[PDB]
Design a protein around this ligand. Structure first.
Ligand SMILES: Nc1ncnc2c1ncn2[C@@H]1O[C@H](CSCC[C@H](N)C(=O)O)[C@@H](O)[C@H]1O
Ligand SMILES: Nc1ncnc2c1ncn2[C@@H]1O[C@H](CSCC[C@H](N)C(=O)O)[C@@H](O)[C@H]1O
Ligand SMILES: [Mg+2]
Ligand SMILES: [Mg+2]
Lengths: 207, 193
């Protein structure tokens, strides 16, 4: 256990335990290897959103609706639009959202996010775009959906450090490392990388 | 270890600051001034850039580095900062003067536990950044969180590199807090409702 995982455990040990129905989602995700947001990364996400106070959020990668539900609980007035291409997890997301009674505010698209731009554009623009899907298609998601961002909006990307594997010589992850370089050298966006959980990138339109 | 490797990776990605800012970073390294770590400062500024605060309170100026960085990020913002060491206060005032930010950044001299009433004149504050003596963190929070705006944010550096404060802060009834493991550790606190 290195210093990174020790600190993560220390932070997790300080967290207030979530409600029972939220813990059930975390338990299910562990059981079925659903890569939901790490506990520590989720807390940082929510606190940034709580500062941002967004009215509309776009999420790419619903899985079982965990992050969408957490975000919704944090922001009672906010509406959330989320995409998922897997049929089973889409099914689970819709049932979970229904069970929490957040189906009035959380809206799930079914299908690949690279083919749903026009349907998502109907309810653009979005104050926050949260990218948390296939790592190889990160640059495509950003390019496709950052026109729908509000003027003072923020794009947040999970899994940009990838368990610290991007930081070392990884060749013998190149796509993630490329995205990070591409994102940090973007002419329209200023970006900070937060080393929490699996790594968060927070991007914002330049002045 | 992995922690320092990730930090180096993030530092390697950073766009280089202006020359006068780099001189502050160089001076701080030369003279063991514990300014905000490069990676931690970027996270701070990006959160502030989202917050877009009009008034910031800072406890622990040192040589004016974090105050200057915050000021450059937020052209409209006014910053009020405290420093009890005479030499660092001297350096802060000269640095701020050299950057020509002395119209917007205002430095108090003295212990922050004895300057509450002078700070209260220009209350309230959208952001309170605590970055001073680690032993007096609970006293700073108690003293200065009444001057926080309704939708304000309290940010504490040096929470990982104290254990009592972290427990105290995480179990505060009026505030919700997340810990960011970057640099020396950041805590971001905010009113629950
Ligand atoms: N191109 C694509 N279009 C839409 N869905 C995607 C995508 N590629 C991956 N996915 C989905 O995105 C999910 C990533 S995991 C999502 C985790 C979730 N945000 C949480 O924290 O709770 C997977 O379930 C996968 O099915
Ligand atoms: N109780 C107190 N009142 C005011 N100043 C304090 C304090 N205890 C510590 N200090 C000052 O706070 C500084 C901590 S270093 C501050 C670093 C600065 N925020 C930056 O990132 O650039 C020290 O220079 C110390 O002199
Ligand atoms: Mg993820
Ligand atoms: Mg510090």
């Amino acid at each position: 256990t290195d210093r990174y995982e020790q600190i993560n455990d220390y932070i997790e040990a300080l967290l207030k335990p979530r409600p029972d129905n939220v813990k059930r989602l975390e338990a299910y995700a562990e059981e079925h290897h659903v890569p939901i947001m790490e506990k520590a990364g989720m807390e940082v996400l929510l606190q940034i959103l709580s500062v941002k106070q967004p009215k509309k959020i776009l999420e790419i990668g619903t899985a079982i609706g965990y992050s969408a539900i957490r975000m919704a609980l944090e922001l009672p007035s906010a509406e959330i639009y989320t995409i998922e291409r897997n049929e089973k997890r889409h099914e689970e997301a819709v049932n979970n959202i229904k069970e929490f009674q957040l189906d009035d505010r959380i809206h799930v698209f079914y299908g690949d996010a690279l083919e749903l731009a026009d349907a998502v554009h109907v309810t653009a623009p979005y104050d926050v775009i949260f990218i948390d899907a296939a790592k190889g298609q990160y640059q495509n998601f950003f390019h496709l959906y950052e026109p729908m961002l509000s003027p003072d909006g923020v794009i947040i990307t999970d899994n940009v450090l990838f368990k610290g594997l991007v930081a070392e010589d990884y060749s013998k992850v190149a796509k993630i490392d490329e995205y990070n370089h591409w994102l940090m050298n973007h002419p329209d966006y200023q970006t900070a990388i937060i080393p929490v959980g699996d790594g968060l990138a927070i991007s914002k339109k330049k002045r």
